[PDB]
Amino acid sequence: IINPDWNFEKMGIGGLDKEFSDIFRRAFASRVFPPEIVEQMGCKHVKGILLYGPPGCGKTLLARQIGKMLNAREPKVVNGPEILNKYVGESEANIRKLFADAEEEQRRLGANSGLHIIIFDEIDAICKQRGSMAGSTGVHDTVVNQLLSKIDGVEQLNNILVIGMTNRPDLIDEALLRPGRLEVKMEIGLPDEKGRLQILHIHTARMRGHQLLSADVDIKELAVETKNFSGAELEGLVRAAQSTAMNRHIKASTKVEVDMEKAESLQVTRGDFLASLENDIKPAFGTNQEDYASYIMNGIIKWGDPVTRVLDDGELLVQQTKNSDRTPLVSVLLEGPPHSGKTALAAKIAEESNFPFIKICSPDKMIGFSETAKCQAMKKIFDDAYKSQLSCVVVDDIERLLDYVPIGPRFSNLVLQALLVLLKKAPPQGRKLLIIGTTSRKDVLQEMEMLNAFSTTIHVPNIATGEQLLEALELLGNFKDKERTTIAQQVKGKKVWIGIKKLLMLIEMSLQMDPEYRVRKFLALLREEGASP
Amino acid sequence: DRTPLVSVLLEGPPHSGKTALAAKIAEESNFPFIKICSPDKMIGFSETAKCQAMKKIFDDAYKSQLSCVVVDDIERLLDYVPIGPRFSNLVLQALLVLLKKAPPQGRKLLIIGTTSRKDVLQEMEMLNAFSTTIHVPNIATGEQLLEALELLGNFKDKERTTIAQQVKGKKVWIGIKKLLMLIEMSLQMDPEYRVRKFLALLREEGASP
Lengths: 533, 209
Ligand SMILES: Nc1ncnc2c1ncn2[C@@H]1O[C@H](COP(=O)(O)OP(=O)(O)OP(=O)(O)O)[C@@H](O)[C@H]1O
Ligand SMILES: Nc1ncnc2c1ncn2[C@@H]1O[C@H](COP(=O)(O)OP(=O)(O)OP(=O)(O)O)[C@@H](O)[C@H]1O
Ligand SMILES: Nc1ncnc2c1ncn2[C@@H]1O[C@H](COP(=O)(O)OP(=O)(O)O)[C@@H](O)[C@H]1O
Known about the structure:
This is part of a larger assembly, with 2 copies of chain A.
Chain A: H1 8-11, H2 21-26, H3 35-41, E1 49-52, H4 60-69, E2 76-77, H5 91-97, H6 100-106, E3 116-121, H7 141-151, E4 160-166, E5 185-187, H8 193-210, H9 219-225, H10 235-255, H11 260-266, H12 272-279, H13 292-295, H14 305-323, E6 329-335, H15 342-352, E7 359-361, H16 371-385, E8 393-395, H17 398-401, H18 413-422, E9 433-439, H19 442-447, E10 457-459, H20 466-476, H21 481-490, H22 500-510, H23 519-528
Parallel strand pairs in A: 1-4, 1-5, 2-3, 3-4, 6-9, 6-10, 7-8, 8-9
Bound molecules: adenosine-5'-triphosphate (2 copies) and adenosine-5'-diphosphate.
């Protein structure tokens, strides 16, 4: 059945060094031992396995490599969603056509037939727990029955192997995972350092063989820089780097006098890697640098001590979350008066944290959604956050997320309960998390018994003295010395209570008049606005 | 043999360690069948899905000659919120019907509860179903606090002596999990300023019963 034309090195899989050893020991330890002993023991072969993990980490590759290694026939790749049909009896026919060749060859060549391999993709899109209550049957009760009957029925097949692949392993039936049916489970996770080195070596072997690499390309660096890259986004990086190198070469010669031999020598690639890494690849489980422009519009500018106090508190919380081991889950709430700029400080803490995973959950992308969809979105974000050795998630404008309105009061309970349950669920073993929240109405949250779930509170104050306002104006740099002195004389009284956002709006508005009438309008607007709580 | 079904409720204040004690009582019983029905595996479910999940767990429990089922965080299952009040009637009725349904002949069961709000559960006429209740208290003395500090093994001798003087002359109403949180949050300062921060946090947290 097996021939010596297979070696592990030639396969080309890097990072799965246990997910293969254990599989080989368990599933395929009876397909290689001499037939005499196996027959004497009288043991049946395993009839399939299940692979789960994030998307794009090398599961299909492993299935095809197993198929080639076992000297099987051509696998019948299938797609889960493309089996269903709207007529009465068409889905079951599609599920039944796959098991035809094995049945035909089992009754003709006796017990000396080949090995047929069947591959399912997204196996959980068809098989879901079957209802129990009378009249509570689902719409896909018939597909599951057909699949169960075919895999292990009254007529025995001993020349088949079934591989299933899925991402959500908690929705599959429970009679489809017992010893005899799919009975071996393995997990394919994100690669680690020594798993991101092997992939790069495998992918640059070709360039090294054909003598295209430069003399300064260091692979330890490239292994270190990419932190949460999945296996499918390193080949993209390599190819993008080579493509930009070629583009540079071509456009150079046309507007350069390099020379043909000079161009060939220039074909080497050293910094294209760095440039492409910077501005070509966007990971799916990594920090995003494109959002901090949307939430930090005018940057953080100091106008007092409270800014420093808040930032230091955030730093201490980050340190605690990183180092301690008795408490792997931490939380904190930022609350203050409206227009005080809380989201900006939350984003600043998150971005200065230096964590591999950073994400922001906000209602800006949830216009028109029904509560159930909002629950699904929140759960998806947290599920993606549970797949890293460090992380941090920010929840914005909790009151807007609950659909609150003072009349009534009226709000939604499903979202509140989901949120109150997701603040106390610890991650898998050995991983850490950090959750930040922002709100303006703390008392309403206090009534909802949602304020003691968080582990700490931080106050974001408001401008409260004239000198602070003058210093903020100086930092902004709009009004000249004489105008500043006039304002200082006018507003020397320390009775100012204004938000840093309303102040920017006021300054922008007041600059729409002639130079003569500038200070008067600004002072009139400031006086008209509230002067105390 | 007269009573093939029993129930019990563990209740106390928040942050006191009810789930841990329920799990430890369940683990040391050597029952062939043990299971836990928690609400963190039911995020986003509607009423009927929760009913079906509970019913399935009990149906499975009814097929062993001995059993033990744990139902924790009862108030999160009912979706309770003081404003209103609001909650789910269907789940409440399902639970109240399942609490007093004997298994087939010859088989035995045991149900353990958990909750931090006993009065609310009493308003709905639910403490009538449970056979009896147990009380889990907090730390309510300086001596017990010192014993807990010694057993956790964090602060050294001299710092222990410093803590002793400022604590024995008052009372304390801190839970046990919150104590771990405070100890962890204090150790992030420089060697000199650890005891001061711990005392400040403890004084802030402490409140009358
Ligand atoms: N020291 C500062 N702190 C916060 N924001 C600042 C500071 N200096 C400048 N800003 C700018 O102020 C704006 C902060 O607005 P932001 O959206 O954070 O307000 P908010 O308090 O969250 O709003 P809302 O009233 O809608 O809740 C951003 O443009 C930020 O760049
Ligand atoms: N003697 C003890 N009793 C209970 N828990 C203890 C004890 N010693 C240490 N612990 C630990 O304290 C923590 C108690 O947290 P736990 O989840 O049990 O609290 P809880 O009562 O369920 O809280 P909540 O009020 O939030 O529902 C667990 O880590 C438990 O291991
Ligand atoms: N362990 C690995 N070693 C080498 N390449 C990998 C590995 N995992 C994933 N890849 C890359 O991923 C690509 C295909 O992945 P794919 O089969 O789509 O993953 P999945 O089946 O999980 O969607 C290939 O081009 C391959 O280079």
